[PDB]
Amino acid sequence: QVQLEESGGGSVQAGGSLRLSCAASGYMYSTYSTYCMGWFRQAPGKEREGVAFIKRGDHSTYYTDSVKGRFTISQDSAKNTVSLQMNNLKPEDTAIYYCAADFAHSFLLSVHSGAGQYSYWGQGTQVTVSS
Amino acid sequence: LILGIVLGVITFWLFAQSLVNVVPNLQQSFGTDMGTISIAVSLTALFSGMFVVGAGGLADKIGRVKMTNIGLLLSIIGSALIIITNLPALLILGRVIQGVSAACIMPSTLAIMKTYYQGAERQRALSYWSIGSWGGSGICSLFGGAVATTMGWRWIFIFSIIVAVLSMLLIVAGLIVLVVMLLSLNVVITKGALWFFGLIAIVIVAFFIFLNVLFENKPYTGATISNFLLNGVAGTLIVANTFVQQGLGYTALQAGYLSITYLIMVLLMIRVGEKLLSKRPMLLGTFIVVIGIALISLVFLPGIFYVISCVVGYLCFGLGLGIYATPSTDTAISNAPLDKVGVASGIYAMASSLGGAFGVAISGAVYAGAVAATSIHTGAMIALWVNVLMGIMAFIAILFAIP
Ligand SMILES: [Zn+2]
């Protein structure tokens, strides 16, 4: 009974900026645990690919090589939400961005990336860039 | 080697419940996707909580230490079977027996405490048993993680076989229609539904069939019914650890420091609960915790230095459970007749377990419902307040536990 409600994205010109925010409703933390949260993109042709992820406990982040430096994932801690700030976008980034989160695990364990490790998925937010 | 052996058997049920918070590392090795590889690990308690009474009864009949010899031996195959071979249909079969391992140990080893001690020594015995359980489960998540990051996921199960050996080296009358009840009742708490309405029927059904297929009017009954109600406040920390980390936006460590402050406090009050001793301290424990909840409830309308009100709550909550646990593990183990301890101890162990599950499920569902309707701060209180009601009902539950 968890719901990943996600917002932002949309259409923009190339070399621009697009925010992507996502929040987990009623996803409680165990006695000594946290969970990882991020986005996977999938263009109409290409196969599902991870973008950026953050561990909610210690703000530990990880990015794919593609977007590294341009994109910046972080969580607005007081407002309780993770948001992927995407900058200097290129037509490669055009795809359906799916927010996801994995089953809780001891915060000691390192931040997650692989789609197999993530369990909760969203409806998917569209992002498209052009000339 | 009285507790030294017993504890080794209890800490076999620590290293079992450590892998539960290292479920992603197992995802890679055993291969199969999450949900299937996670529920695989869940089976260890699922089977434990339902068999504890039966495995307690077959320990009651065919030797107490006989079944503690089985459990500790069954914990070797339980671990060796998993650690050695890395494949999925394998994992399931090893976790189910890892569960029956505990079902054999908890009640039987609890009965040995009655024989070994027989009054006065029982106080020091059951206190050492509590340290073995509370302290063990208390770190199991923080343990399993530390092991998986540096040693590995399999290196938490190499510690399971050697401690299970160093334990032994330092020393069907409707059961099937009870486990079918408890299997259903256990998975009813895990509410992922429309379809759970019929899963509550199979509980009510198999209950009345076992009810017409057991004449306790002692303070033991009062202790078991109170122990259930008292463990219903278990959600308090889960809802608190969430609120602190989501609502107040703290890190994972500060959340763990508030938690391990509760852990050391509850562990250094089962000793003081021993000296405290029967009914008097169990009323003080069930009382002071309700204030410990209220102290953590009032941090939903706080200031900048209201971290104290929360902190003192974790101590107030921690120390209360400690003052109740040793007297109340004794009030049950005492009045439990020497002829039938294995069955009696298994029921007290089951009542303790179901109490926690029933508590967390309510605490979570309320929080998830309240935080959706209202906000994180407002929602937390509604959830924390529901923990107070059970804490008061746990204080009222002692009314039916005479001196
Ligand atoms: Zn994760």
Residue numbers in the entry:
A (entry chain C): 5 to 135
B (entry chain A): 11 to 181, 199 to 220, 227 to 246, 259 to 322, 327 to 452
Task: List passages from the publication reporting this PDB structure.
In this study, we report the X-ray structure of NorC, a 14-transmembrane major facilitator superfamily member that is implicated in fluoroquinolone resistance in drug-resistant Staphylococcus aureus strains, at a resolution of 3.6 Å. The NorC structure was determined in complex with a single-domain camelid antibody that interacts at the extracellular face of the transporter and stabilizes it in an outward-open conformation. The TM helices are organized in two six-helix bundles, a conserved feature of MFS transporters, with the linker between the helical domains forming two additional TM helices leading to a 6 + 2 + 6 arrangement. The helices 1 to 6 and 9 to 14 are related by a pseudo twofold symmetry that facilitates conformational transitions through the rocker-switch mechanism.
The structure of the ICab–NorC complex was solved at a resolution of 3.6 Å. Multiple rounds of model building and refinement iteratively led to the convergence of refinement and generated a significantly improved electron density map. A mutation in TM13, K398A, allowed a marginal improvement of data quality to 3.6 Å with improved side-chain densities in the molecule leading to the refinement of the structure to acceptable R-factors. Unlike QacA, NorC lacks any negatively charged residues within the vestibule although a single cationic charge at K398 is observed in the cytosolic half of TM13 whose side chain is positioned facing the vestibule. The location of K398, in NorC, coincides with the position of E407 in TM13 of QacA homology model where it was observed to be vital as both a general protonation site and substrate recognition site for certain substrates. Theoretical estimation of pKa of K398 yielded a value of 8.030. This value is lower than the pKa of solvent-exposed lysine, which is usually around 10.431. The reduction in pKa of lysine to a physiological range facilitates proton exchange during substrate transport. TPP+ interaction is observed in both NorB and NorC K398A leading to a nominal enhancement of stability (ΔTm = +1.2 °C and +2.7 °C, respectively). TPP+ interacts despite mutating the protonatable lysine in the vestibule (K398) suggesting that the compound, given its multiple phenyl groups, could interact at an allosteric site stabilizing the outward-open conformation of NorC. This is very different from competitive binding displayed by TPP+ in antibacterial efflux transporters, MdfA and QacA, wherein substituting the primary protonation sites leads to a clear loss of TPP+ interaction and transport propensity.
